[PDB]
């Protein structure tokens, strides 16, 4: 599924991401835009052999099992394919574990490079929330 910007903001708010660990909703919408272009089916392979999955590009080295990332962990206890669903619940629940892990949203390279320190409220402007 490719979400609209406001549709995704609404879904994320419903799932408890607005101000989760102090990160306002716009941060999450911005991260999703630049990680996946709001596409739940996005995948990208990394040089180390791991793959990033779904709307928030969650990585198989640590967070999910894809059966092809040797010696990896599965800290979210889910198959990586669950992160590609039209239902964002699994992605949100895993993202909450990631952002609690110590480096906050800096875990997402696109967030650090393209959202951090910018006017992220713009991402939710105009939306019925
Ligand atoms: Cl915001
Ligand atoms: Cl933080």
Swiss-Prot record:
Query: Any other comment in the entry?
Result: Lysozyme C is capable of both hydrolysis and transglycosylation; it also shows a slight esterase activity. It acts rapidly on both peptide-substituted and unsubstituted peptidoglycan, and slowly on chitin oligosaccharides.
Mainly resides where?
secreted
Q: What does this protein do?
A: Lysozymes have primarily a bacteriolytic function; those in tissues and body fluids are associated with the monocyte-macrophage system and enhance the activity of immunoagents. Has bacteriolytic activity against M.luteus.
What is this enzyme's catalytic activity, as reactions?
Hydrolysis of (1->4)-beta-linkages between N-acetylmuramic acid and N-acetyl-D-glucosamine residues in a peptidoglycan and between N-acetyl-D-glucosamine residues in chitodextrins
The record's annotation in InterPro entries points to: Glyco_hydro_22, Glyco_hydro_22_CS, Glyco_hydro_22_lys, Lysozyme-like_dom_sf
Protein name, please?
A: Lysozyme C
- E.C. designation(s): 3.2.1.17
Record: active site: 35, 52
Cystine pairings recorded for this chain = 6-127, 30-115, 64-80, 76-94
What tissues express this gene product?
A: In the egg white and polymorphonuclear leukocytes.
What assembly does the database describe for this protein?
Monomer.
Describe the location of the C-type lysozyme domain by residue ranges. 1-129
Give GO cellular component annotations, separated by semicolons. cytoplasm; endoplasmic reticulum; extracellular space
Q: Name one GO biological process term.
A: killing of cells of another organism
Q: Which PROSITE patterns match?
A: GLYCOSYL_HYDROL_F22_1, GLYCOSYL_HYDROL_F22_2
**Location of the protein in the cell:** Secreted
Task: Give GO terms: molecular function aspect only.
Answer: beta-N-acetylglucosaminidase activity; identical protein binding; lysozyme activity
* PANTHER family documented for this protein: LYSOZYME C
Q: Which UniProt keywords apply?
A: Allergen, Antimicrobial, Bacteriolytic enzyme, Disulfide bond, Glycosidase, Hydrolase, Secreted, Signal
Give the binding site residues for substrate: 101
Similarity comment: family membership: Belongs to the glycosyl hydrolase 22 family.
